[PDB]
């Protein structure tokens, strides 16, 4: 619960806002289904109220977005979204900042990674099957990342490499599946220890590291894309500090 | 690539895979699928070692035109005649029993090709190897199963980026080489610890990925003996 985490939380809601705004513009039923599922899942991981009411009020919010006027502009949708979230008792959904950038997306992806590892490290005896289900939702969330802003290069790249994140989500799933059948999980401090285990080791804070290293990989790779020589990259030690992990 | 028993299986599995791909061309139900198949098949034969480029275009053009009403066994006879007539007998597979092992072999085959290319690159062929690695990314992105396993396809669609990510790591290394040389390290732990690149990186990545798939299928089914890098390096004389 640090200053960078506070940015993350607000970017998470900005991303969710801009996602449901697209529902009214959707040009196919498949995309409508895709958008509204994703938006429901995102709010499900967001903490807005206290779960039974939350999930039902989100359904109301999603249903109102599906129906809103396709001929509104973005700023009009924002007006009526702010009213709708107020009357639904969902002012927690309201983003403080509405300036949408690549940092909005990245923040959302890092937030999601922070959620995975807190659920996993506080997984106890009885909640094992429940986390197993949340991990499935997380895989669908990362498979269907919308950029919303225009960047065809970026969307082509992510479709190519997003399987690196999902892979590690499945590593967790195997670790939880082993824990259910006896072999408890030993949390280790580094990617290299889990790597060596190749017997149930899982890195503490695994997805923060995975999303952090992936984020560096994208930035490294864009010098190839535009043909330039590269420059301060984010480090793991530094990253843990900013987030007090 | 060191010639061993298992590597000889890989090479024949690779050709069998490539045969079964071009059999799909006459059946294609969309221009997009046709272009995608012929491209992959051209790419696959480009990495095969069989003038060769031109005759492979002829082989590909003949399979695009082949009768759609043929069955597989007839296509197989005509293909054997065509590859003979074009002086491409090195394209014909010795065995035609298509299983999951044929696909895996082909994927570890391509992983062996990447590593060799990379380790034996000179400063003059740097741009060339970069060009091949981009062709390799397309190959792994577009892996067809051919056999029926809808669950397999969905799963690979979800996690294939794990392999392509590691191809991109190589391009980042060759790009730094173009401006800091790459130091080859022997272990994934050494490369991941930090311009270091693991020697035989893709054979380890593909081996690790292979184990992960088999691990994961017990989840998929609600239900001993896996492959190790030491044992794998030995089988292949790495
Ligand atoms: C999924 C995705 C795919 C993308 N693909 C491409 C592409 O193919 N080609 C292209 O040109 N651009 C791509 N981008 C955008 C690109 O990665 C940057 O966001 C953009 O180039 C802006 O550069 P920047 O340094 O100003 O912002 P960024 O560095 O990317 O983000 C700014 C913020 O992110 C934080 N940050 C920086 N590095 C890290 C890190 N490793 N881990 C965690 N936080 C970090 C910092 O606090 C900084 O405040 C992609 C973005 C996303 C979210
Ligand atoms: C891309 C791909 C995705 C797949 N996804 C799924 C899925 O989601 N669900 C499912 O049930 N099945 C899936 N399969 C099939 C599965 O992986 C096995 O091939 C199949 O279940 C048969 O198991 P097997 O033990 O007989 O063969 P395998 O264990 O797959 O391997 C047979 C041969 O491969 C060699 N080998 C074995 N392990 C390794 C290793 N780690 N590294 C290198 N070589 C090895 C050995 O020489 C062995 O002879 C997939 C296969 C492929 C190629």
Curated annotation (Swiss-Prot), chain B:
Cellular component, GO, one term: host cell nucleus
Entry protein name: FAD-linked sulfhydryl oxidase
Superkingdom of source: Viruses
Alphabetic keyword roster: Early protein, Host cytoplasm, Host nucleus, Oxidoreductase
Main location as per UniProt: host cell
EC number(s) on file: 1.8.3.2
Any one GO molecular function term: thiol oxidase activity
Function: Functional FAD-linked sulfhydryl oxidase that is required for infectious budded virion (BV) production and for the formation of enveloped occluded virion (ODV).
Catalysed transformations (reactions): 2 R'C(R)SH + O2 = R'C(R)S-S(R)CR' + H2O2
Claim: RNA-binding is one of the keywords in the record: no
Subunit: Homodimer.
Any one Pfam family match given in the protein's UniProt record, by short name: Baculo_p33
Assigned protein family: Belongs to the baculoviridae p33 family.
Cellular compartment(s): Host cytoplasm; Host nucleus
